[PDB]
């Protein structure tokens, strides 16, 4: 894609969506139901029971586990970053003190209970005593709330595990990278004193847990390309470059060019312009920052390209260049400049040789300056250093102070003094002319090396993800004519990253890192939950697709499925984030209770072949409910549906062998006494033998009480109903108003901030006086 589109994608990433809770999370609600006496007669007083607010649990145990994975997703969506309960507070109309409660749904329950005529006076007293307590000294507030125990657990976790931390000026200042603060070239200032009640959210700057730099070569190529584009966007632009026309004229005078051949010149002057110099500066710094491999493009007939390549290999570690291009450049330098200078036979270098041309030349060359420069170029490498918790690639200290430029120069000088025994005098003249052009700007070259190093390290301080040095799938093409332009046109103007540019680069890096980590956390949580919920029919490709799409720098159309499943495997070995893990632990603990609260499904059906008395349960009357599957062989309906082998269940149904079919089933609620006497519940299992399907199974639940049309049979015959089948199901829990009151505590008020560096005003010292790590000015040429 165009680089501009990639930059727009990277700079459009927001810090993180901040979630606020507006209402208490609730899975349950109170519901008033008629109750019945032990003889099945209806009472005049109803009772409040806990019921599912949205009873939508499906049929089949596997589908129930899918439902609970969806519920985990919903809870994670509703989990807030912070919480102020004053926002949820509403007036309790029956409060003695006219106090407040949270949330509005609690107030609705309070009003419904208080206004009800069947309410015990103690409950009304309790509702009258419900009010909030404010402790302004501690910035705390407590509100009464009516919550189911599971609802209370979830909301309490939300309240006690918020993500906001106190914010002050010291925190804002320390949020800046330590190396930027340590730099004496930047002055930082503030004009605000943040209040003690200010808050902020720390980004999750954990280092790469997927290690995409290892064996995810295409994804790593995309990541490195994005980093390269961002680095190019933030690298400062060269200014006060030597006038291209004036420098070209000076070079023509030095080369003693024939008149009018400046346009046609291709040995020294081709490709020299300010655009190429600026592009070289940007390419070098951006490639080093993003650790993107570079490819050298040059024409062997251009001697200036070879001398600029000598300088480039002196200053840039050679691991930054693709091997073939580096080998070609070194071979051209050796066979055009060094060996002909010393009269050595042209190197016959083998493609694929374990040694680079410079490594061979170092052994073969007797001159000490040339051999020393060759050895340094051979061994010049980055140093891996963990600085401020981030892995970085650090240049050699002699590169940072531009001292290597002297070593190279020494070699060049020794090459200018050689006789070139086997070459015509014009060849020596051409090499001397190229060396003269480069060495007329020795001070500028030292300044340029120091400037490159300083800009590199200053922008490196702003990187939050580890600088992993690994060769990339694709390269960035660097033309040696651009290096020649940079060498020949760089002035004495010091360009260093602007403080606001550094802050923007750091913020973009932080946002990308935080997005990476948060999407990793989401994917890991979903994968681990699906594994712990035994969702064996679930293909996790969608999770990885969502993860990669939310990373927002990969085009998933180019990502095959095997790579996504490798990503799944790597994510599966990572621990779950503490908040998500605890939420999932709560869901695992309470999913049985949540499922058994459903009125749409039953937990099973016990097919006995003896008369079992219907149970007395005040909210049903007489009901053929089984509280447990004790004393019955269990057939797992999920396993039966998965395997399709109906031999066992068919044999048990044909032989009238008592059994319990276990699994989320729908049931028919039949309140007819005549239906119970007719034994219809025992007639609903023949279809299993007929069709060998259990998804159609729908056991009958009897609900016998005075509301039944023929309840007189129960009343007029002192008869306790019996049935041969039972529904494995639970009875609802009574809603006790006092036991459901919890004082939710939160902070009374605070303000949350997002962009800390918006509070920092930063300026640069005069560039003429900007200093490097060695306390000397970056550029000293005049």
């Amino acid at each position: 894609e165009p680089k501009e589109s990639i930059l727009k994608k990277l700079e459009d990433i927001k810090p993180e969506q901040v979630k606020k809770q507006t209402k208490l999370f609730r899975i349950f609600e109170p519901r008033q139901l008629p109750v019945y006496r032990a003889n099945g007669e209806k009472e005049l007083r109803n009772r409040w029971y806990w019921k599912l607010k949205r009873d939508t649990l499906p049929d089949g145990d596997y589908d129930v586990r899918e439902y609970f994975l969806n519920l985990y997703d919903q809870v994670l969506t509703e989990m807030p970053d912070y919480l102020l309960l004053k926002d949820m507070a509403v007036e309790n109309k029956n409060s003695r003190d006219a106090g407040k409660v949270v949330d509005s749904e609690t107030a609705a329950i309070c009003d419904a209970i208080f206004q009800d005529e069947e309410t015990e006076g103690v409950v009304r007293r309790f509702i009258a005593e419900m009010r909030q307590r404010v402790q302004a000294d501690r910035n705390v507030v407590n509100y009464p709330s009516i919550l189911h125990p599971i609802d209370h657990a979830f909301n309490e976790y939300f309240l006690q595990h918020q993500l906001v931390e106190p914010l002050n000026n010291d925190i804002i200042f320390n949020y800046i990278p330590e190396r930027i603060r340590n730099d004496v070239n930047y002055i930082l200032n503030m004009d605000r004193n943040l209040p003690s009640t200010a808050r902020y959210i720390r980004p999750n700057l954990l280092q790469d847990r997927l290690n995409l730099h290892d064996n995810f070569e295409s994804l790593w190529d995309t990541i490195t390309t994005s980093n390269y584009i961002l680095a190019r966007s933030v690298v400062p632009d060269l200014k006060e470059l030597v006038s291209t026309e004036a420098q070209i004229q000076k070079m023509s005078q030095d080369l003693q060019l024939e008149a009018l051949t400046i346009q046609s010149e291709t040995q020294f002057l081709t490709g020299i312009n300010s655009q190429a110099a600026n592009d070289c500066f940007k390419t070098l710094i951006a490639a080093m920052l993003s650790q993107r491999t570079m490819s050298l493009d040059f024409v062997t007939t251009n001697y200036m390209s070879l001398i600029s390549g000598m300088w480039l290999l002196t200053v840039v570690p050679n691991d930054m260049f693709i091997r073939e291009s580096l080998v070609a450049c070194q071979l051209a330098i050796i066979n055009t400049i060094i060996y002909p200078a010393f009269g050595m036979q042209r190197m016959h270098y083998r493609n694929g040789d374990p040694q680079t041309p410079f490594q061979i030349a170092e052994q073969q060359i007797q001159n000490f300056q040339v051999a020393n420069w060759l050895h340094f170029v051979n061994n010049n490498q980055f140093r891996q250093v963990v600085i401020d918790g981030v892995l970085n690639q650090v240049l050699n200290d002699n590169i940072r102070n531009g001292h290597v430029v002297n070593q190279l120069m020494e070699a060049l000088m020794q090459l200018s003094r050689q006789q070139f025994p086997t070459m015509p005098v014009d060849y020596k003249r051409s090499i001397q002319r190229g060396i003269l052009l480069l060495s007329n700007r020795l001070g500028q070259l030292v300044d340029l090396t120091r400037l490159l190093a300083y800009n590199y390290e200053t922008l490196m301080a702003c990187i939050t993800m580890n600088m992993q040095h690994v060769q990339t799938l694709t390269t960035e093409k660097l033309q040696l004519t651009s290096v020649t332009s940079l060498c020949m046109l760089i002035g004495n103007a010091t360009v260093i990253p602007s403080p606001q540019t550094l802050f923007h680069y750091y913020n973009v890096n932080v946002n990308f890192h935080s997005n990476y980590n948060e999407r990793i956390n989401d994917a890991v949580a979903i994968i681990t939950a699906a594994n712990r919920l035994n969702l064996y029919q679930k293909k996790m490709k969608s999770i990885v697709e969502d993860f990669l799409k939310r990373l927002q720098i990969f085009d998933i159309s180019r990502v095959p499925d095997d790579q996504m499943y490798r990503l799944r495997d790597r994510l599966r070995l990572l621990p779950v984030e503490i908040r998500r893990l605890d939420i999932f632990n709560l869901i695992l603990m309470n999913m049985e209770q949540i499922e058994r609260a459903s009125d749409k499904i039953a937990q099973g059906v016990i097919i006995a072949y003896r008369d079992m008395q219907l149970e007395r349960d005040e909210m049903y009357g007489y009901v053929n409910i089984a509280r447990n599957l004790d004393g019955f062989q269990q057939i797992n309906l999920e396993e039966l549906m998965r395997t399709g082998d109906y031999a066992q269940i068919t044999n048990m149904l044909l032989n009238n062998q008592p059994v319990a079919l276990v699994g989320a089933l729908p049931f028919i609620t039949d309140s007819s006494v005549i239906s119970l006497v007719a034994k219809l519940d025992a007639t609903v299992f023949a279809q299993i033998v007929k069709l060998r399907k259990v998804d159609t199974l729908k056991p009958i639940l009897y609900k016998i009480n005075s509301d039944s049309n023929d309840f007189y049979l129960v009343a007029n015959y002192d008869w306790v109903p019996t049935s041969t089948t039972k529904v494995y199901k639970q009875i609802p829990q009574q809603f006790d108003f006092r036991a459901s009151m919890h004082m939710l505590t939160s902070n009374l008020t605070f303000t949350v901030y997002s962009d800390l560096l918006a509070f920092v005003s930063a300026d640069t010292v005069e560039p003429i006086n900007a200093v490097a790590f060695d306390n000397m000015r970056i550029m000293n040429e005049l």
């Binding site: 680089k3 930059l7 700079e11 690298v235 006038s243 655009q275 592009d279």
Partner: protein
């Protein structure tokens, strides 16, 4: 009337890379990204300019500008440049020398100027 909006439109497009003059035609290119910061008063002025367009009987040109204002993208800015260039082809305005001059030499000179500023200037 038609060329007025351009003076504000240039301020509504973010920079995603740009050129930088070096010497008289030489450009070095930057990948620098700059967001367009536009106050509400400028948007009010642009609204007034479009209202002036419509008060003169223009319907298509202000509609085009409004459509471009949805995204303020540089990819569709060629239409804005097209309108700007087309505005100048409605001919010259060869009014009388008297009126044109009087418009030129329409001055309101005052003794109430900042003496310090004028002395420094």
């Amino acid at each position: 009337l038609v060329s007025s909006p351009m003076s504000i439109l240039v301020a509504l497009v973010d920079i995603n890379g740009t050129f930088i003059t070096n010497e008289e035609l030489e450009l070095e290119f930057s990948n620098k990204y700059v967001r367009a910061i536009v106050p509400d008063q400028t948007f009010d002025e642009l609204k007034q300019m479009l209202d002036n367009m419509r008060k003169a009987g223009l319907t298509d040109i202000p509609k085009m500008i409004q459509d471009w204002l949805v995204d303020c993208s540089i990819e569709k800015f060629p239409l804005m440049a097209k309108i700007y260039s087309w505005s100048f082809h409605v001919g010259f305005r060869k009014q009388k020398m008297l009126d044109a001059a009087l418009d030129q030499l329409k001055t309101e000179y005052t003794e109430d100027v900042d003496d310090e500023m004028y002395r420094e200037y």
